[PDB]
Design an enzyme around this catalytic site. Structure first.
Site, PDB file in Angstrom:
ATOM      1  N   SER B  47      25.249  -4.759   3.599  1.00 33.76           N
ATOM      2  CA  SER B  47      26.638  -5.005   3.259  1.00 33.76           C
ATOM      3  C   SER B  47      27.018  -6.474   3.321  1.00 33.76           C
ATOM      4  O   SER B  47      28.166  -6.804   2.986  1.00 33.76           O
ATOM      5  CB  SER B  47      27.553  -4.180   4.163  1.00 33.76           C
ATOM      6  OG  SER B  47      27.497  -2.809   3.793  1.00 33.76           O
ATOM      7  N   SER B  95      33.351  -2.493   5.437  1.00 39.50           N
ATOM      8  CA  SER B  95      32.137  -2.298   4.645  1.00 39.50           C
ATOM      9  C   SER B  95      32.175  -0.975   3.889  1.00 39.50           C
ATOM     10  O   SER B  95      31.287  -0.129   4.005  1.00 39.50           O
ATOM     11  CB  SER B  95      30.879  -2.389   5.501  1.00 39.50           C
ATOM     12  OG  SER B  95      30.950  -3.464   6.407  1.00 39.50           O
TER      13      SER B  95
HETATM   14  O1  LIG Z   1      28.646  -2.717  10.919  1.00 36.16           O
HETATM   15  S1  LIG Z   1      28.794  -2.824   9.477  1.00 36.16           S
HETATM   16  O2  LIG Z   1      27.932  -3.847   8.902  1.00 36.16           O
HETATM   17  O3  LIG Z   1      30.179  -2.982   9.074  1.00 36.16           O
HETATM   18  C1  LIG Z   1      28.247  -1.278   8.796  1.00 36.16           C
HETATM   19  C2  LIG Z   1      28.293  -0.123   9.569  1.00 36.16           C
HETATM   20  C3  LIG Z   1      27.855   1.080   9.032  1.00 36.16           C
HETATM   21  C4  LIG Z   1      27.359   1.135   7.727  1.00 36.16           C
HETATM   22  C5  LIG Z   1      27.318  -0.033   6.962  1.00 36.16           C
HETATM   23  C6  LIG Z   1      27.768  -1.234   7.496  1.00 36.16           C
HETATM   24  C7  LIG Z   1      26.713   0.251   5.609  1.00 36.16           C
HETATM   25  C8  LIG Z   1      26.342   1.709   5.717  1.00 36.16           C
HETATM   26  C9  LIG Z   1      25.665   2.520   4.815  1.00 36.16           C
HETATM   27  C10 LIG Z   1      25.442   3.855   5.116  1.00 36.16           C
HETATM   28  S2  LIG Z   1      24.521   4.869   3.990  1.00 36.16           S
HETATM   29  O4  LIG Z   1      23.626   3.970   3.274  1.00 36.16           O
HETATM   30  O5  LIG Z   1      23.800   5.829   4.803  1.00 36.16           O
HETATM   31  O6  LIG Z   1      25.493   5.499   3.115  1.00 36.16           O
HETATM   32  C11 LIG Z   1      25.910   4.395   6.308  1.00 36.16           C
HETATM   33  C12 LIG Z   1      26.583   3.584   7.212  1.00 36.16           C
HETATM   34  C13 LIG Z   1      26.792   2.232   6.931  1.00 36.16           C
HETATM   35 NA    NA Z   2      25.476  -2.595   5.479  1.00 32.76          NA
END
Ligand SMILES: O=S(=O)(O)c1ccc2c(c1)Cc1cc(S(=O)(=O)O)ccc1-2
Ligand code: NA
Ligand SMILES: O=S(=O)(O)c1ccc2c(c1)Cc1cc(S(=O)(=O)O)ccc1-2
Ligand SMILES: [Cl-]
Ligand SMILES: [Cl-]
Ligand SMILES: [Cl-]
Lengths: 242, 242
Positions: B47, B95
């Site tokens: 992200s 995100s």
């Molecule tokens: O801490 S943060 O950088 O803001 C953060 C925290 C959780 C998640 C993301 C970014 C990107 C992301 C993708 C996916 S998935 O690909 O399974 O759909 C699941 C959870 C998260």
């Molecule tokens: Na991410």
């Protein structure tokens, strides 16, 4: 559309002071204040004029961008933060008056006047010196008029370039955490009575923005911290910030 | 110069973790890191890719400005803050992947490719799905390549309009203080091993700015807070922040 709420006077009484806080819910388009008469009372903007001053100086090329350094002129003055080099962002944070007095001198009275009429800024009067009229000249603005000015700035609707408006909103940054953002400008009217302190700006939330403009009697510099403290107490009371 | 300071590994091992912190001092044109090899190893941006993706979307008119609302599509996803209306500011802060997947589909593979080439972004490779290549495709970027990309952003030097770069730098706002400003983007590479957590951006001081890019191993989402916590400790060790 405007509602008087003298609950908030209790926050002025405690610190044995008096003044006005004006909030504007942007989503609902509704205004709130502890005192609608003082809300519409026009005082000298003092260093809150650094907001329109910045816009004019940037739109005219007097200030090239927020990184341009303005060297100290060597005359040590009574505020320590003034006796060093500054850019637009630090000159605003510390209310460096002589930096902005140079902007004003290079803007000139003719162009300063047309811009304040364009901005709808207060009584739009620059009587006095072009480099001190916001401290001891003819300009006057009410807290509600400050809100009206700030809303146009927030919406990129003032009669300047979008770039000028984005730079000044960047320079107005005061505070920010996971809960909110505050863009504001402090002011201390010191040369003509009544001595008053200003704090005008807005609070950015996830799904709203709350404009505020406050002033209060400031007979001593020892009360300057109350400007933020009292306004935060009102914001806390109306669940705007934790 | 570049200089290796392994002192920081203390901060990583005290929480049973492993990572790299990269610091760039803009005024002195000098870099620092606890591990020079890992500083140039390229991982999925996850992200943190929301920074270039925002720039491209704004510059192409897929997003008109930061107030434009992307309404919730009604699918209830696992992350609670994703299941609501968003604008660019809040989509970046939380995100919100589905909002940025929509940007990628409107940008399309051809324009996306061309933009990353002009950005010099990482390996400039969008192999994989057009709306998930930064999470499970062929794009890769190192921590120092992040610094280099952020430096152009800060200086308005990317190929996109100055307006795009100023809007994104606004959305990057995370924390602001009487002492500093932090513009940054968090990331979490969850789909391809090794699972890592990112934090990239910079710290604006009164007369200097410190760019930083960090990543660390992250087997579980339970430790995502260490990204900021460990980075701030490093900033405290170098007396950049108080
Ligand atoms: O801490 S943060 O950088 O803001 C953060 C925290 C959780 C998640 C993301 C970014 C990107 C992301 C993708 C996916 S998935 O690909 O399974 O759909 C699941 C959870 C998260
Ligand atoms: Na991410
Ligand atoms: O709290 S602040 O609003 O940041 C603030 C604090 C001090 C002073 C000013 C603003 C404007 C000002 C002018 C003068 S002078 O006219 O005597 O030269 C002296 C002091 C100050
Ligand atoms: Cl805005
Ligand atoms: Cl900002
Ligand atoms: Cl716009």
């Amino acid at each position: 559309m405007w509602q008087e709420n003298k609950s908030w006077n209790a926050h002025f009484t405690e610190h044995k002071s008096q003044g006005v806080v004006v909030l504007w819910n942007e989503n609902k388009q509704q205004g709130f204040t502890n005192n609608l008469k003082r809300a519409n009372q026009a005082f000298l903007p003092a260093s809150t004029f650094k907001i329109p001053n910045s816009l004019i100086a940037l739109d005219l090329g007097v200030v090239k961008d927020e990184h341009q350094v303005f060297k100290w002129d060597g005359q040590t003055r009574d505020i320590a933060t003034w006796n060093r080099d500054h850019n637009l962002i630090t000159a605003m944070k510390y209310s460096v008056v002589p930096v902005y007095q140079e902007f004003a001198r290079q803007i000139g009275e003719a162009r300063m006047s047309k811009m304040l009429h364009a901005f709808d800024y207060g009584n739009e009067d620059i009587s006095g010196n072009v480099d001190s009229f916001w401290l001891d000249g003819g300009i006057r603005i009410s807290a509600t008029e400050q809100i009206s000015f700030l809303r146009k700035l927030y919406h990129n609707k003032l009669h300047v370039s979008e770039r000028s408006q984005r730079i000044v909103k960047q320079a107005m940054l005061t505070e920010a955490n996971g809960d909110y953002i505050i863009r504001a400008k402090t002011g201390y009217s010191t040369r003509i009575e009544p001595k008053i302190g200003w704090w005008v700006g807005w609070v950015e939330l996830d799904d709203n923005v709350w404009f505020f403009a406050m002033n209060m009697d400031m007979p001593t510099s020892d009360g300057l911290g109350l400007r933020q403290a009292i306004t935060k107490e009102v914001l806390k009371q109306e669940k705007i910030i934790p």
